[PDB]
Scaffold this active site. Structure first.
Site, PDB file in Angstrom:
ATOM      1  N   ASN A  89       0.839  -1.196   0.000  1.00  0.00           N
ATOM      2  CA  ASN A  89       0.000   0.000   0.000  1.00  0.00           C
ATOM      3  C   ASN A  89       0.878   1.252   0.000  1.00  0.00           C
ATOM      4  OD1 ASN A  89      -2.044   1.868   0.161  1.00  0.00           O
ATOM      5  ND2 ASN A  89      -2.957   1.062   2.047  1.00  0.00           N
ATOM      6  N   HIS A 129      -4.716   3.086  11.990  1.00  0.00           N
ATOM      7  CA  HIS A 129      -5.445   1.884  11.596  1.00  0.00           C
ATOM      8  C   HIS A 129      -6.380   1.416  12.706  1.00  0.00           C
ATOM      9  CE1 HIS A 129      -3.720   0.907   7.666  1.00  0.00           C
ATOM     10  NE2 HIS A 129      -2.555   1.327   8.127  1.00  0.00           N
TER      11      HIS A 129
END
Ligand SMILES: CC(C)CCC[C@@H](C)[C@H]1CC[C@H]2[C@@H]3CC=C4C[C@@H](O)CC[C@]4(C)[C@H]3CC[C@]12C
Ligand SMILES: CC(C)CCC[C@@H](C)[C@H]1CC[C@H]2[C@@H]3CC=C4C[C@@H](O)CC[C@]4(C)[C@H]3CC[C@]12C
Lengths: 397, 397
Positions: free
Chosen positions: B298, B337
């Site tokens: 990512n 996250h």
């Protein structure tokens, strides 16, 4: 068939790092398998890890197995060779060879169907070998009968042509050949330079790891799905969920046992014997057609079947259509596989046979690659599901 | 960062027919998924296939979601742009800019923490969006706050340097950029020649298929494992078998949602917007080291985090060791996250946070590739297991 010295396809495809990390992904899944197994055993028993129970079960009567395989090796090494040696000279000298050749052919046919047709079967059905230990020597029975038929069918036309022109093998090359991986007596006349001890060492290590990985696959994926799940609903929902959930164990067994047996087993027994001078499979995962898939999976058995069975069974039948001959050799291959599974499992219900016929006659009349993969997944799932179901059903009652 | 026009790595790696048959294997598994699902629904209900229940649940308040995202798009498009437009000229002309610059910076910080810090949170926690519908717009909140901070942090040094030398953006390029896949205001100055309608068509079709494949993965693999399996033994054996059996759904979700979101989602929104002029991931499955794995998964979020957070957080702290700064930016990424998962799940218990710290400080002190894969499998398994366990535990009681 010409034997060109190219290696196995996976041994040259596995150096690409995406496939290399597929391999490391598999062995890390194996690490997680052994870790979960040891943790479960240590939390259930409290101590005393590393039992290896099911390998002590399925490999039980191993002295009997090694004695049976030793007498089998001696029989297949001596009796066909001595029979052919006795037949060749008498065929050369006798006044009428049309009767003597048929007589010695009858001797060989009563050997390969009498000795290699009952001995490996009678030992199994009398001394009652465990399923893996009976499977290993019925596979050796199949391999030996195929190899002996190959030997005789490559030697009889040779002698007949040299006698119409008016070439016996040597003991050493036959002794070596019945250890070679291939199944055609053309043999390993092309050979390898040197036995690389580290290379065959890592190949046998991979055989070790793949066998224990199959063991753990049966321990964690085929033990929960198939050990005595018998709160019988007889439900079609339960059956379809079994044939669904048993695709992962089925397809992992397929991938890894293809890999293990072909690639590393007979590449270890290739480079140990200095005959790694042939390929044993092309990419079967890439088949535009199913008939294209037949020619490129387990190409040793395919070479034997196609060449000997197909060529002789069409040249002697003289059929107008060769598609009938292809279906006939596929039927004989299906019955051979069904017999192997029936003697190693001790079971009827050949779902392999009817499933093979269904998937053959259903494809006869890249989207087709997806259809091949869905057919292969569903068929492997139903095959493993139904065979394991029967095996654990007779073990149930 | 320089944006060079190379494509996605998977879009050029997927033409190799082994990876192509991996892809066909996946979509044939999807065919088997839909076939098993339709057969189970037809044998349970008798008729009336194709219900799509859980997508009607998790995508419930979609008008509210589209209105919230519309006002969010308008806010992030107007208020930061107008704020910066009002600040630039006054910074140029005023007698004392040290106080006015801090004042407008406080305005922007009370916007991106007040509007984009409460609005997407208050809408979720007040109108009570279903979990997927709240996840989509909290992901849009994260994306918008990151993109606005990138915009302001690329424009403020530009204006400051041009005013010390004594460059405002245009409405059109910002309007286009907040639709672009990338997360750095450097932007899509390199662009693509043409929108290929068939190409973006098949990319959105793959998005459709991957989303429904995730749906079926939750239907057949995360429904049996996690829907009300509550004959509570509280057993560590049951927990270790859950963390084992939930590796296949976990790792399939990982593979396929990486593929889906990054590759096909933002390649559709790349070639639809003519900016497919950057890579969004290198091969993370091939990482010799775990620190090497951090830089190449990512890479959009990594570019944002590393560049802005790392560079500014070390240049302003002036630490003697940069390893402390790397651990600090990893901690802020872990908390970001964890906050995302906590607002979309409505849950505490950040197993992601402590598991991240454990796998980070356990690797700090090709066999390591196998260790990376076993760590990744066990961590993905425990992450999906524990988060789904909590979600179906509050849904239980
Ligand atoms: C329509 C849906 C079902 C298609 C889903 C396709 C996905 C699951 C497939 C297509 C391309 C595939 C990837 C292609 C390349 C690699 C590199 C290899 O070393 C590990 C597997 C990995 C990382 C594959 C994972 C699975 C993958 C992402
Ligand atoms: C020690 C044990 C666990 C190692 C087992 C390795 C086995 C399972 C791995 C190693 C090499 C792998 C193969 C390499 C190449 C391909 C081609 C690809 O298009 C489909 C998968 C397939 C067919 C792989 C299947 C799995 C495979 C055979």
């Amino acid at each position: 068939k010409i034997f060109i010295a190219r290696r196995s396809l996976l041994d040259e495809l596995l150096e690409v790092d995406h496939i290399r990390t597929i391999y490391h992904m598999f062995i890390a899944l194996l690490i997680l398998f052994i870790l979960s197994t040891l943790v479960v055993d240590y939390i259930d028993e409290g101590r005393l890890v590393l039992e290896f129970s099911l390998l002590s079960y399925a490999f039980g009567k191993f002295p009997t197995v090694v004695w049976t395989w030793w007498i089998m090796f001696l029989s297949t090494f001596s009796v066909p060779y001595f029979l052919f040696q006795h037949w060749a000279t008498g065929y050369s000298k006798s006044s009428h060879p049309l009767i003597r050749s048929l007589f010695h052919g009858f001797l060989f046919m009563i050997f390969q169907i009498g000795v290699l047709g009952f001995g490996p079967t009678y030992v199994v059905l009398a001394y009652t070998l465990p399923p893996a230990s009976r499977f290993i020597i019925i596979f050796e029975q199949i391999r030996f009968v195929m190899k002996a038929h190959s030997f005789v069918r490559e030697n009889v036309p040779r002698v007949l042509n040299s006698a119409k022109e008016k070439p016996i093998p040597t003991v050493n090359q036959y002794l070596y050949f019945l250890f070679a991986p291939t199944l055609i007596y053309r043999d390993s006349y092309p050979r390898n330079p040197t036995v690389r001890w580290g290379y065959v060492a890592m190949k046998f290590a991979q055989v070790f790891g793949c066998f224990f990985y199959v063991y753990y696959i049966f321990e964690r994926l085929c033990a929960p799905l198939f050990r005595n799940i018998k709160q019988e609903p007889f439900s079609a929902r339960v059956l379809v969920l079994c044939v669904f959930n048993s695709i992962l164990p089925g397809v992992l067994i397929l991938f890894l046992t293809f890999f293990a047996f072909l690639h590393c087993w007979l590449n270890a027994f290739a480079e140990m014997l200095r005959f790694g001078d042939r390929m044993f499979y092309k990419d079967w995962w890439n088949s535009t057609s199913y008939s294209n898939y037949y020619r490129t999976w387990n190409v040793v058995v395919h070479d034997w079947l196609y060449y000997y069975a197909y060529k002789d069974f069409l040249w002697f039948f003289s059929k107008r259509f060769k598609s009938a001959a292809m279906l006939a050799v596929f039927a004989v291959s299906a019955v051979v596989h069904e017999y192997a599974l029936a003697v190693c499992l001790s079971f009827f219900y050949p779902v392999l046979f009817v499933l093979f016929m269904f998937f053959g006659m259903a494809f006869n009349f890249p989207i087709w690659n997806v259809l091949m993969w869905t057919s292969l997944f569903l068929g492997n799932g139903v095959l493993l599901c139904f065979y394991s179901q029967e095996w654990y059903a007779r073990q149930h009652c």
